[PDB]
Structure formats: C-alpha cells, structure tokens
Amino acid sequence: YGFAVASVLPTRGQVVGVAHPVVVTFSAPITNPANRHAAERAVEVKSTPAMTGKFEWLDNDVVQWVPDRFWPAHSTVELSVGSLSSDFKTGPAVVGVASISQHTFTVSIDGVEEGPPPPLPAPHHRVHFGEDGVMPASMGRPEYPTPVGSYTVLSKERSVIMDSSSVGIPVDDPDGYRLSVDYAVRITSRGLYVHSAPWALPALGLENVSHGCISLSREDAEWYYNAVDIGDPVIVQE
Ligand SMILES: [Ca+2]
C-alpha cells in the first residue's frame, strides 16, 4: 500500500476553473524517484471527456497531473484516479493573457473579451484601450522579468502583504519593498501574482516596472479577481 491515495483535487462536485490540475495526495511519501513511475501508473488519470496530461511531483507525497488542454467550460468532468471514481464541475473559461511587449492583460470569458465599465474620473486621465477586455498592465522590469509560460490560478486573496524577499531582496535592503496588495491572484508557488498596483498607474500599458508580477489598476484587478476562479489559466507571452 505504498501508493495508497489519501485524497484527490478537485473534490467531488467542486467548481473549478478550466485548467485545474488533478492533484493526488499519497498517504505516505514516495521518496524513491525510481518508484514514481509505478506510482504514476497506479494513479492513472482517466477523464470524460478524454484528456492528455503530464505528471509533476510537488512533494514526495503529492503528484499533480496537468492537462495538456483546457477542460470544457460549464461542464461536469468525470474523473477516475486509480479506480477511485469522482467528478467535478467547471465554471466559465476565464482566460487572462499577459503580453510583455504590448503591456496588456487581455481577459476573455468563454472566448469573449470583456472588462469592467470605464470610470468617468479615474484620475487626471490614464491609458485605456477601448477594445473589450484589453487591460493596460505592467510586467517585470528586465532585471526581474515576468517568465513566459502557461500558468493556472493557484489562489485568490485580499489585502495580502507582499514582501521583497520573494525575489531575493531583504525588506530593509535599499531596493526592497513591503506592500499591502488589495486584490491578489497567485499564479505560481514561488510568488508570482496578478494584482492591483495603484502606485504603478503611470506605467500601465507603457512600461514593465514590476518585479515579475502582472500589475493592474485597482479597478481592472478587482474585476478580474471577481471573475476568475482557482484553476483558470493565465498565459504570459512575449
Ligand atoms: Ca472554485
């Protein structure tokens, strides 16, 4: 019973975003990497509709299966993991695409680009594109760039403290920082977020000045935060 499965995410009947992985937690650590292939076969993921994917070990006792494609939105996905039968539900496909070169974050809901209504007085004025769902954004500066890739929303939190130690700079170090971030959508375990950055307004849509994170206005961040679910995909591209 070395490959005994304690639990699986999504839980039965959970509502998740359209790229949510299948996360398998084992009752005991599998410390021998050579045994992980046999463990992967024991927890073979069989979904309806059929889906290909790849296993990634998060800990000695946690392997996640990352689907190669998005689940269908607004659906019930049947899931078998090593004879354990389950199911879960998907909400809308809320997809965010960050473009480093455009300085934009484009949100679509079930394929239709959409964003919040515009404010009559945002400040003196500010960049806004007039194309649905295209939000002006600021990615990482060249010293701390936003890495290109395909991500999923790992968590959503309010008023979270973000500290400069996440990118290798002490709080009291000269170029360090300690911020309270109003809306925070975490997309990597190491601490990459889509978030509200009101101090960074003049750069949005124009310049990449963050330390890796995808910076939005408070209003754009609030709307995206309220729309997105854990498991929804975020794509970062050049
Ligand atoms: Ca959810």
From Swiss-Prot:
GO molecular function, one term: acyltransferase activity
Keywords linked to the UniProt accession: Acyltransferase, Cell shape, Cell wall biogenesis/degradation, Peptidoglycan synthesis, Transferase
Residue intervals of the L,D-TPase catalytic domain: 94-237
Pfam family, one: Big_10
UniProt entry tagged with the keyword Acyltransferase: yes
EC number: 2.3.2.-
Positions bearing the site annotation: Covalently binds to acetyl group of faropenem: C213
Record entry for activity regulation: Is irreversibly inactivated by the beta-lactam carbapenems via the formation of a covalent adduct resulting from acylation of the catalytic Cys. Imipenem is the most efficient drug for in vitro LdtMt3/Rv1433 inactivation.
Pathway(s) per entry: Cell wall biogenesis; peptidoglycan biosynthesis
Active site annotation, chain numbering: H195 (proton donor/acceptor), C213 (nucleophile)
Biological processes, Gene Ontology terms: cell wall organization; peptidoglycan-protein cross-linking; regulation of cell shape
UniProt keyword Acyltransferase, yes or no: yes
Free-text function comment from the UniProt entry: Probable L,D-transpeptidase that may perform as-yet-unknown cross-linking reactions in M.tuberculosis. Is not able to generate 3->3 cross-links in peptidoglycan, using tetrapeptide stems as acyl donor substrates. May function in the anchoring of proteins to peptidoglycan.
Protein name in UniProt: Probable L,D-transpeptidase 3
Annotated source species: Mycobacterium tuberculosis (strain ATCC 25618 / H37Rv)
Lineage: Bacteria, Bacillati, Actinomycetota, Actinomycetes, Mycobacteriales
